[PDB]
Each structure stands twice: as structure tokens, then as C-alpha cells.
């Protein structure tokens, strides 16, 4: 029933976990506790097989552990800065090559899978710092420039006309801008990892930089030069929607160093580079 | 089904492209690859006719390539400036002879057709620059003055009463103004091009200026003179809705120089005036 399923959604009881059944003492030549990890399979033994369990009705649900839930939280992916210091024409606009590689928190979650397909919800949080006292009337323009489209080189570049590109105009005092983007790849899923190159020579590029071009985000303060200088910082947040993921993998164990690459740095004392905490010995809890 | 068509709209699968069917080796006196371009027709040969193709189910859709989609994006067509410098009465109001000829991006798209019919969505983005520090309380008035109606000559002209003309009042801090205009022509479609005059003498005007009079947009800062001077720039955006276009044509290949005319300038080295990039020779890719 689309109404019974509705109730399960509100109560978050779509994916229930199995109950524990009562078990009894056993004496058999069937030894579930014994197996062979060499097979590459996990022993499917359950608590009822190793101890005498009581009957217990499980009420836990796995809804929150779903992929949609795990990757469905909006996190920061970029912090754009427009700092008016001494030249309005040069400092009132900027650009960013879009990617989800610059902020560790969301990057690590997505990288727990090899491939992922999803639509994106982008939410922007602009904050205007009054360096000289006033902020005046701040109006911002955020333009999505897909690869190939002309990139503005001045604050009055014709490209800002946005005759085809999508632009979002925000006015200080109005709610935070937000829009959705459909799965953008030319492939069936996004590559979280890519063991390939864009050629076959010693100078060919390696990794996701080869497959993950998302274009550029061009910003500018629409308002013309004002007496008082401001510093506008626009933080970009991303949330995956209608998500699918494939081939889970080991979580990032060391700090990230660069975008689109798994490269890392190691110090002289490696235990400082990983979350593992040195044990005094094998028997010290 | 109006509900099945609804699903296709959400998924953007209204216009599907044909599949590729499996083909086989052939030996015939029917040679599809041979034709005669002199006829003025394009050879309708398909991949199945020149190679042995496999069967492939197409999932691509042409929805986004529709005329409605192509011309249905809001782009800048005008940037109105009210700059208070030394005389509020003279600098607090202005006028603009409406047209879609001043901004290259949208002009070029519409000019890929000879005639076009559509309703228009006008969105305005006003931004108040505080030249002296404060902006006070800015209230703007945008009045559409159809040809013939009295044009204001002062900021307190009786014409601002707008007893019949449509006026939009915007208050700083409120969302961007927006309104729709129905297809305005006295003809069945707008002329993107017009090989005609408004008379038959050496002094008759030539081109779309003869057929495309849309009236004037008169603006003024409603707020009376304030101590601190401001510069209000209102950018006008246009989007075509419920569109139809006829007789496609070659895209503009050189920069535009003036409104309502196809005139252009040529330098001593013409390859700099077009997007064509000189080839080293016929065999250098």
C-alpha cells in the first residue's frame, strides 16, 4: 500500500532487522563456528549458533544506513572569496573549477565507493563582511559555465549576459540560493577513482582529472563599485539526491593532499599519519 | 494519457531518437552512398548502410534541442544606469528604446531564424551602489510607454502618473521584479530580418528598424533626493515563452556593430574577424 509505505517512511521503519530466536544446547558434528577465511567469504554464523539465546523482537531499522541517507546530507565543497582591497574591477569577480575534491568530509564519504550516480542539490551561503562599515546593496551573480563556454575575463565581460548559461542572482537580505543539477556525466556514473590516462605517453595525465570535468563556476558582485570595501565569502554546499553507488572500498586512511589524486605524504613516524593509536602491547586494552 | 505525457516531461523523454539496427554485408547495384548534392537535398544514408552495425537501443532525447528550450533561457538585453553625480532632477530618471539588438548572446540565437513568435518574460535585477556610504530607502518605477504615449521629460512629469501605461514599482530589499508580455507585433511574427524599407527614396530607412518598434522603457528613482548619492543599475533580462520560429539561417559569423542592421566591420586580416582558425595546410589536423 502506498499509504502503508508512507507510514513506514514517517516512522523510519522501512528496513527492519531480524529478530534473535531462542536457541538451545547442542552436541553435533556440524560445527558452524568453524570455517575457512581463505575462501574469501565471511562465516555466516549468528549468535543463536554459539550460545543459548532468548527470543528477542528487534525494533531497529536500517533506513538511516541507506546510501541515500549516508550521502544525502549537505556539506561544504567550496568557499569562494571576493575581497575588495584596492581594485574593484579586478577583485569583484572570480572563478572556480568545480569539483568535490577540496573538502575532506564529503570527499571521504563519496570515496567509500568506486562509482556513484546522483543528482545534486547546491545551496549557497553568502556572507558580506563590512570592512569599512557599510555593505550597501549587495547583489551577486553565480554563473555555471559548462566546459567550452566563454569564461569572463573582466567584471563587464559579455559572457555575464548569460544568454544560455544558467545564472543565479542573489540579493542581500533574501534567503539562501538553491538549485538542483541532474546527473551530469557523459558516462553512466561518476568515477570516484580512475586507474587510467588521457593518453599513452610519459606525459599523459592520470586519475579522475581525466574523467571528471564539471566546468566552471563564475561569480561577480553585480553591484557597481561602492565607497566602502567589502569581503564577500560564498560557501557552496552539496547534497546528493536519488543516489546509487557501486563497489565499496577502504576508507581514506591518511590526509588528502591534492585534488583528483590519491597521493599522500608520510612523516618519519608513520603512526602520526594514520588514525591508529599505538598499543602498549597485545594484552593492554 | 495526460499523465503518461507528464512522466515524459519530468524525465525529459518526449522526443526520442531512433535505434541503430543490426546490418549485414551487402553486394548490390543499389549504392546508397552515392547521390547528387546538386539536387539541393541531403543524402539520407545512415550508418547501417555503410558498415555492419550491431543493434543498439537509443536512450537519447531531443527535448533540450527544441525551439522552446533553445530560446527559453533568460538573458540580459539591457543595462540601465541612473548615476547621481551632481543634479538629482536630471540624473534620477532615464529612458530606453526597447529592442533585443544590443546584447550579442541572445541576439545571435534569435537571429538563427528569419521569423519568430513568442510571449516574453521580463525579469529585472536592480543593484544600488552606495557612492557616499548609504543607500537610504530606494523605490524604483519602471514604466512601459508604448509608441505614441507621452514620454516624461522631468522626474515629476505628469506621465509618471501611469493612468493607463503599465508601471512596476520595486522596493529595495524585495525580490526581483518580473512580468510577462504577450506577443506584441502588429504582424503574425517578429521579423528577425527585413529586406525592406519604410519608403521608396534614397532616404528611406532599411531593415528591422522599420518593423520592430516596441516603444520605450522609462525609469526613475521614486524616492526624492537624498543626502548620499547612489548609482542604480537595473539589468533587464528576457526569456521567450510559447515560442515558434521559421526559416532557419546561417549564424552571425562576425561581431555585431549596430542595432537593427547586419552591417559589420572588416580588418586588413579578415581571419581575425571570424571564428575560423587558419590551418597550416590541408593535412594538418
Amino acid at each position: 500500500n502506498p499509504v502503508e509505505r508512507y507510514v513506514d517512511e514517517v516512522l523510519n521503519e522501512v528496513l527492519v532487522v531480524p529478530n534473535i530466536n531462542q536457541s538451545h544446547p547442542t552436541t553435533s558434528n556440524a560445527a558452524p563456528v568453524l570455517d575457512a577465511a581463505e575462501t574469501g567469504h565471511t562465516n555466516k554464523i549468528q549468535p543463536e549458533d554459539t550460545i543459548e539465546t532468548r527470543y528477542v523482537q528487534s525494533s531497529q531499522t536500517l533506513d538511516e544506513m541507506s546510501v541515500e541517507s549516508f550521502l544525502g546530507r549537505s556539506g561544504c565543497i567550496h568557499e569562494s572569496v571576493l575581497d575588495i582591497v584596492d581594485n574593484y574591477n579586478d577583485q569583484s569577480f572570480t572563478k572556480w573549477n568545480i569539483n568535490l575534491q577540496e573538502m575532506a568530509q564529503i570527499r571521504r564519504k563519496f570515496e567509500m565507493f568506486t562509482y556513484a550516480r546522483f543528482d545534486s542539490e547546491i545551496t549557497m551561503v553568502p556572507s558580506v563582511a563590512a570592512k569599512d562599515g557599510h555593505i550597501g546593496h549587495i547583489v551577486m551573480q553565480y554563473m555555471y559555465v559548462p566546459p567550452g563556454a566563454p569564461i569572463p575575463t573582466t567584471r563587464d565581460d559579455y559572457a555575464w549576459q548569460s544568454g544560455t548559461n544558467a545564472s543565479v542572482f542573489w540579493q542581500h537580505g533574501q534567503p539562501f540560493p538553491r538549485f538542483s543539477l541532474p546527473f551530469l556525466s557523459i558516462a553512466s556514473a561518476y568515477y570516484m577513482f580512475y586507474d587510467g590516462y588521457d593518453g599513452d605517453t610519459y606525459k599523459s595525465r592520470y586519475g579522475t582529472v581525466v574523467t571528471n570535468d564539471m566546468g566552471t563556476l563564475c561569480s561577480r558582485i553585480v553591484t557597481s563599485e561602492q565607497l566602502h570595501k567589502v569581503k564577500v565569502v560564498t560557501r557552496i554546499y552539496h547534497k546528493a539526491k536519488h543516489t546509487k553507488a557501486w563497489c565499496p572500498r577502504p576508507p581514506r586512511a591518511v590526509q588528502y593532499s591534492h585534488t583528483h589524486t590519491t597521493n599522500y605524504k608520510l612523516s618519519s613516524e608513520v603512526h602520526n599519519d594514520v588514525a591508529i593509536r599505538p598499543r602498549t602491547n597485545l594484552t593492554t586494552v | 494519457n495526460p499523465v503518461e505525457r507528464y512522466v515524459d516531461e519530468v524525465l525529459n523523454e518526449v522526443l526520442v531518437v531512433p535505434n541503430i539496427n543490426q546490418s549485414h554485408p551487402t553486394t548490390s547495384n543499389a549504392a546508397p552512398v552515392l547521390d547528387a548534392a546538386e539536387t539541393g537535398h541531403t543524402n539520407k544514408i545512415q550508418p547501417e548502410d555503410t558498415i555492419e552495425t550491431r543493434y543498439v537501443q537509443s536512450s537519447q532525447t531531443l527535448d533540450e534541442m527544441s525551439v522552446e528550450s533553445f530560446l527559453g533561457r533568460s538573458g540580459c538585453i539591457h543595462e540601465s544606469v541612473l548615476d547621481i553625480v551632481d543634479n538629482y532632477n536630471d540624473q534620477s530618471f532615464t529612458k530606453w528604446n526597447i529592442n533585443l539588438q544590443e546584447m550579442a548572446q541572445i541576439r545571435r540565437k534569435f537571429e538563427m531564424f528569419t521569423y519568430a513568435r513568442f510571449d516574453s518574460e521580463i525579469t529585472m535585477v536592480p543593484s544600488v551602489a552606495a557612492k557616499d556610504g548609504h543607500i537610504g530607502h530606494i523605490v524604483m518605477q519602471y514604466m512601459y510607454v508604448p509608441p505614441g504615449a507621452p514620454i516624461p521629460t522631468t522626474r515629476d512629469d505628469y506621465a509618471w502618473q501611469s493612468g493607463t501605461n503599465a508601471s512596476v514599482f520595486w522596493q529595495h530589499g524585495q525580490p526581483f521584479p518580473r512580468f510577462s508580455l504577450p506577443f506584441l507585433s502588429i504582424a503574425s511574427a517578429y521579423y528577425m530580418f527585413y529586406d525592406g524599407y519604410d519608403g521608396d527614396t534614397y532616404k528611406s530607412r532599411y531593415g528591422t528598424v522599420v518593423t520592430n518598434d516596441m516603444g520605450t522603457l522609462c525609469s526613475r528613482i521614486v524616492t526624492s533626493e537624498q543626502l548620499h548619492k547612489v548609482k542604480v543599475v537595473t539589468r533587464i533580462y528576457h526569456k521567450a515563452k510559447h515560442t515558434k520560429a521559421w526559416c532557419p539561417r546561417p549564424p552571425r559569423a562576425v561581431q555585431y556593430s549596430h542595432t537593427h542592421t547586419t552591417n559589420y566591420k572588416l580588418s586588413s586580416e579578415v581571419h581575425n574577424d571570424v571564428a575560423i582558425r587558419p590551418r597550416t595546410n590541408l593535412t594538418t589536423v
Binding site: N1, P2, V3 | V10
Partner: peptide, 29 residues
């Protein structure tokens, strides 16, 4: 779109925009 259900407990699954990408989080399973 309104995917109206009935049981009376009526469910109104409304999609305010015309693109699939615009809707909220997906259902599970």
C-alpha cells in the same frame, strides 16, 4: 505531480517542478 493515495489517510506525494532532479530524497529499497 500529485500521487494521491487512499486508505481515510490520503497521501499527497507532490512534485512542484518539472524535472526529476528537483524532487527530494528518494524512497528506500
Amino acid at each position: 505531480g500529485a500521487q494521491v493515495s487512499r486508505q481515510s489517510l490520503n497521501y499527497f506525494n507532490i512534485n512542484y517542478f518539472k524535472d526529476a532532479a528537483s524532487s527530494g530524497a528518494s524512497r528506500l529499497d
